[PDB]
Every structure is written in C-alpha cells, then in structure tokens.
C-alpha cells in the first residue's frame, strides 16, 4: 500500500489536528524528562531505567566468559 501522505492531500493539518498541532518538539527531545514530565512513561514501561545495579566489570571479555 501507499504511504499515509497520499491520503492526507486535501485536508488541512495533515494528520495532526487543528487545535493541537504538529509542532517541533513539544515535551522535549529524546527521552528527556524521565523523572519530571515523562515520569508516567517511565513508571509504566521502563521502571528499571534509572539507577544503578550491581558490580561493574570494566571490560567484560566475551570470549573468556563464553559458556553456552
């Protein structure tokens, strides 16, 4: 099938609403605001994103630890 743009020719506000809009970056760029305004996105879908777990191994070697 074709892309969605080929059906949105003719309609103002291509698919993004008149009152809303397609603005540049509302909410911020990337995954910022994970503790402020996208906290609901991180409490729901990535609750283990923030913080530290466990003992760091500086340069884990894959071939030495290979044991399938």
Partner 1 sequence: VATAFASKKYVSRGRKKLVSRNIYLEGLAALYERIAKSSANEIVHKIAAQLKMSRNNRPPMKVSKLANISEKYPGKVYVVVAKVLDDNCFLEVPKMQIVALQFSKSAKEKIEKAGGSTHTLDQLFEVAPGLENVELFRGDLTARKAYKYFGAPGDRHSRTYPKTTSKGKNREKRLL
Partner 2 sequence: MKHNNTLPNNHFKKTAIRFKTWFNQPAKKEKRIQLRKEKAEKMYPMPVEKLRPIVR
Binding site for Mg ion (CB under 5 A): 13, 15
Number of residues that bind partner 1 (CB under 8 A): 12
Is 47 one of the binding residues for RNA (CB under 7 A)?
A: no
- Binding partner 1 (rule: CB under 8 A), the pick from 6, 20, 45, 59 is 45
What lies within 8 Å, CB to CB, of 9 at 6+ separation is none
Cβ neighbours for 47, distance < 8 A, ≥ 6 positions apart = none
C-alpha to C-alpha distance for 24 and 27, rounded to whole angstroms: 10
Q: How far is the CB of 47 from partner 1 (least distance, A)?
A: 4
Q: Which of partner 2, partner 1, Mg ion, none binds 30 (CB below 5-8 Å, type-dependent)?
A: partner 2
Q: Are 9 and 15 in contact (CB under 8 A)?
A: no
């Amino acid at each position: 099938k074709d892309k969605k743009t080929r059906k949105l020719r003719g309609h103002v506000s291509h698919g993004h609403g008149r009152v809303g809009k397609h603005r540049k970056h509302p909410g911020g760029r990337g995954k910022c605001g994970g503790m402020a305004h996208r906290k609901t996105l991180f409490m729901k879908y990535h609750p283990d994103h923030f913080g530290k777990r466990g003992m760091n191994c500086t340069h884990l070697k894959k071939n030495a630890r290979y044991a399938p």
